[PDB]
Copies of this chain bind each other. A is one copy, B any other.
Amino acid sequence: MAMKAYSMLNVTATLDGRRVIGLMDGDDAITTSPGVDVGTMLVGADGSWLFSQTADKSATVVIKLKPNSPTHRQLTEKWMAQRAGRLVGFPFDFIDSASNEGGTGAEFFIQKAPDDSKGNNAVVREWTIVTGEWTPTIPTLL
């Protein structure tokens, strides 16, 4: 079980049961960022210090898809479902098999929508999703 080379052929992402397939080119196709800073250091006028830790365990994820990808169809159906009035979680979770690095969430929600650009060639479609809780998994294989 040697720590093999990194490859996109071992990263798996699941969005409400079905997989994510059509991804745009680039070094950043699925990016997750935390909500706020972990903490804040406050230093007074005398030199003492006090650290404050937040309770906000939330994250956002950005997915970049080609204009022709079944995940795009699934997401554009979910967006219309939200617009109609129905509101549900559709859990999303992704992981790398080489080092067990990644995370999972229980209830996400569509936060942004892509811009439909036609032009002369294909263009990215970016979706931004937001969770209320986000649990990373500890990479046990280093």
A residues near B (Cβ < 8 Å) are: 2-11, 13, 20-58, 66-70, 72-73, 76-77, 79-80, 82-83, 85, 87-88, 94, 96, 98-99, 101-103, 109-113, 115-123, 130-133, 136, 138-140, 142
Q: Are B4 and A87 in contact, CB atoms less than 8 angstroms apart? A: yes
Q: Are A41 and B58 in contact, CB atoms less than 8 angstroms apart? A: yes
Q: Are B80 and A138 in contact, CB atoms less than 8 angstroms apart? A: yes
Given contacts A28-B118, A44-B66, 7 further A-B contacts (CB under 8 A): A29-B45, A35-B41, A38-B79, A39-B111, A53-B87, A57-B83, A102-B116
Q: Given that A5-B52, A117-B30, A119-B27 are contacting pairs, would A76 and B45 also be in contact in the complex, using a CB cutoff of 8 Å?
A: no
Minimum Cβ distance to chain B for residue A18 (Å)? 12
Q: Are B139 and A42 in contact, CB atoms less than 8 angstroms apart? A: no
- Copies of this chain assembled into the complex: 5
Minimum Cβ distance to chain B for residue A134 (Å)? 10
Q: Are A116 and B140 in contact, CB atoms less than 8 angstroms apart? A: no
Q: Given that A8-B118, A117-B31 are contacting pairs, would A109 and B66 also be in contact in the complex, using a CB cutoff of 8 Å?
A: no
Among A82, A88, A133: residue with most chain B CB under 10 A:
A82
Q: Given that A30-B117, A41-B58, A118-B11 are contacting pairs, would A6 and B110 also be in contact in the complex, using a CB cutoff of 8 Å?
A: no
